[PDB]
């Protein structure tokens, strides 16, 4: 599907600090929106689309911090 982060886990940010987010879980999607705004070190970001697809659920939404190994979103891409 499309995950949040990768088998990472590793050095660096580890985690997701979402702060806020911009959609809401069982949309549609488009190829221009946008997904969290994340903080970490000294930035505080997003994740712009690679793709559009539904955004079939979202477990934590913001608030709370997530980790890798731990998924966050998921995207549904069938043919990417």
């Given at each position: 599907?499309?995950?949040?982060?990768?088998?990472?886990?590793?050095?660096?940010?580890?985690?997701?600090?979402?702060?806020?987010?911009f959609?809401?879980?069982?949309?549609?999607?488009?190829?221009?929106?946008?997904?969290?705004?994340?903080?970490?070190?000294?930035?505080?970001?997003?994740?712009?689309?690679?793709?559009?697809?539904?955004v079939?659920?979202?477990?934590?939404?913001?608030?709370?911090?997530?980790?890798?190994?731990?998924?966050?979103?998921?995207?549904?891409?069938?043919?990417?």
């Amino acid at each position: 599907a499309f995950e949040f982060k990768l088998p990472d886990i590793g050095e660096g940010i580890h985690e997701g600090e979402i702060v806020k987010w911009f959609v809401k879980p069982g949309d549609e999607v488009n190829e221009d929106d946008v997904l969290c705004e994340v903080q970490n070190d000294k930035a505080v970001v997003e994740i712009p689309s690679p793709v559009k697809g539904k955004v079939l659920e979202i477990l934590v939404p913001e608030g709370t911090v997530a980790t890798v190994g731990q998924t966050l979103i998921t995207l549904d891409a069938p043919g990417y």
